[PDB]
Design a protein around this ligand. Structure first.
Ligand SMILES: CSCC[C@H](N)C(=O)NS(=O)(=O)OC[C@H]1O[C@@H](N2C=NC3=C(N)NC=NC32)[C@H](O)[C@@H]1O
Ligand SMILES: [Zn+2]
Length: 547
């Protein structure tokens, strides 16, 4: 019995969920469902990251309050995640009372502990709109090639990089007014003070090898103080005792993990679990599933923030690579930039969950969704290997034996081979070696289908006096199916439900030790149908048209 708190990165509230995000939530959900199957106390937590200048400016363009826009995006996001059956125990928001109080608390403790410094800096300022401008909101003519209408610190024409201050005839993307340098006091988090603490953390062998290596690069470059304040106008949390100053979104974002859990506890009327999970001497486990582009925040700023505020640190960080479609970054022009909602119009959630899982590993490598291979893998593995085991045998049981399975296993040894694999497959799920688990499961499926081929029930069915043998053979195939679906339960939630309805039994990890004997099963409509390239073409075409 373990206590585990698992999170996925908090998606920004200024964009729709796409297949890239889904890889992250699907990987976490499979791990979480497996942990639940092994009987642990699990708390799967997430929320929308709703602060920041971009969000503030978007709402303004749309002519609505940031609170209205984020509210709409929060519902959109949760609807999509629900469509893919991501089993969160709570989905909250960084813009909440819980996060506000927790953000103020942590800040106050850090300051109290001498980890916050004051410093004045110079930055481009929009005198017309009356707001400091982040680089991406400063446009002008490239100093090098002189190309007009360039944004940020780089020219999309000659590719040169430079400070926005170097842009010729600068202009605010907000008002179009000419920007100017202006001073401002900022608050900094003294990350450098936790250097040794962080280095030991990196060196423990807990973090993924590739992540540890990455961190060594950052220590080499040298840690610096982190600017965690932003001036009004800004959509975020105001800094105590600092009128007109707000916490930079990345400061309150990870605290959102804590805010979402506190929210869950308070809603449950649970007054002891928050401290049991976050206090320094906690015996519970904390895990964050994140993409490799936000590792700096989670491996350096985050642990240091918790340490300096007297809270426990993450047990581990689980980093994943990026999703590519047909081998390349999603392309809007090619119709490979696919939204989660769009996907569900063409395929079911189980298909993508399975494809991603078959390709996932414990490393940070990229995951490629090759659409052609997708159709082939789904049809060959789900339809032809696993579901086939049920469909080719259920008919005889229902029509010839009134849905009743044999009183004994026809091949006890073969069944033992299947149950004997639970240890290694469970370890594969546990260690996040999803690709390994799937290969082992499909290897078993091949064995099961070979067994059925060897017995040839379609032949036995037409031989008089072989009734008892037919029931024995078909019952055996169905029990092998029972075991396989148990191993795949964390992966295919819906197919699993349809499987449990047919089998008249909930599938539990330990349950496979007791095969279904003299047991009534129910007839069933198609458990899973084949898909085809025409559907893929439709998906791509729709995606092209949507942008
Ligand atoms: C306290 S965590 C705050 C995270 C921040 N709001 C953020 O970052 N939001 S995000 O919406 O841009 O990204 C959410 C997660 O999606 C992941 N991905 C975004 N695009 C992706 C792919 N194309 N492929 C794989 N993961 C992707 C990111 O790495 C990130 O972990
Ligand atoms: Zn240029």
């Amino acid at each position: 019995a373990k206590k585990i708190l698992v999170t996925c990165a908090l998606p920004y509230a200024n964009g729709s969920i796409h297949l890239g995000h889904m890889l992250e939530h699907i990987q976490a959900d499979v791990w979480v469902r497996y942990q639940r199957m092994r009987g642990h106390e699990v708390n799967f937590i997430c929320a929308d990251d709703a602060h920041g200048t971009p969000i503030m400016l978007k709402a303004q363009q749309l002519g609505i309050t940031p609170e209205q826009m984020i509210g709409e995006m929060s519902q959109e996001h949760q609807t999509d995640f629900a469509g893919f059956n991501i089993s969160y125990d709570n989905y909250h928001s960084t813009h909440s009372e819980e996060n506000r109080q927790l953000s103020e608390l942590i800040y106050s403790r850090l300051k109290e502990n001498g980890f916050i410094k004051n410093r004045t800096i110079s930055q481009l300022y929009d005198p017309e709109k009356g707001m400091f401008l982040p680089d991406r909101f400063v446009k002008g003519t490239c100093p090098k090639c002189k190309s007009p209408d360039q944004y940020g610190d780089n020219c999309e024409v000659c590719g040169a990089t430079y400070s926005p201050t170097e842009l010729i005839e600068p202009k605010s993307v907000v008002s179009g007014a000419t920007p100017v340098m202006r001073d401002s006091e900022h608050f900094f988090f003294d990350l450098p003070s936790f250097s040794e603490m962080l280095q030991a953390w990196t060196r423990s062998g807990a973090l993924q090898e590739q992540v540890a290596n990455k961190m060594q690069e950052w220590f080499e470059s040298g840690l610096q103080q982190w600017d965690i304040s932003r001036d009004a106008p800004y959509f975020g949390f105001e800094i105590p005792n600092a009128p007109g100053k707000y916490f930079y979104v990345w400061l309150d974002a990870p605290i959102g993990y804590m805010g979402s859990f506190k929210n869950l506890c308070d809603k449950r009327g649970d007054s002891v679990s928050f401290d049991e999970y976050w206090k320094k001497d906690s015996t519970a486990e904390l895990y964050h599933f994140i993409g490799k582009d936000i590792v700096y925040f989670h491996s350096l700023f985050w642990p240091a923030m918790l340490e300096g505020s007297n809270f426990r640190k993450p047990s581990n960080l689980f980093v994943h690579g990026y999703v590519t479609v047909n081998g390349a970054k999603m392309s809007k022009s090619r119709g490979t930039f696919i939204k989660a909602s769009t996907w569900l119009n063409h395929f079911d959630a189980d298909s993508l969950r399975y494809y991603y899982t078959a390709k996932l590993s414990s490393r940070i490598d990229d995951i490629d969704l090759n659409l052609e291979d997708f159709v082939q893998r789904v049809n060959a593995d789900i339809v032809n290997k696993v579901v086939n085991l049920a469909s080719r045998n259920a008919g005889f049981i229902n029509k010839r034996f009134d849905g009743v399975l044999a009183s004994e296993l026809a091949d006890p040894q073969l069944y033992k081979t299947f149950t004997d694999a639970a240890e290694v497959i469970g370890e594969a799920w546990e260690s996040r070696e999803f690709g390994k688990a799937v290969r082992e499961i499909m290897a078993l499926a091949d064995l099961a289908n070979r067994y059925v081929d060897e017995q040839a029930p379609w032949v036995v069915a037409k031989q008089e006096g072989r009734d008892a043998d037919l029931q024995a053979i078909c019952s055996m195939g169905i029990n092998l199916f029972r075991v396989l679906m148990t191993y795949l339960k964390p992966v295919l939630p819906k197919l699993t439900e349809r499987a449990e309805a047919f089998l008249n039994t909930e599938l539990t990890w330990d349950g496979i030790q007791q095969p279904l004997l003299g047991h009534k099963v129910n007839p069933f409509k198609a458990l899973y149908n084949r898909i085809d390239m025409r559907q893929v073409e439709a998906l791509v075409e729709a995606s092209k048209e949507e942008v």
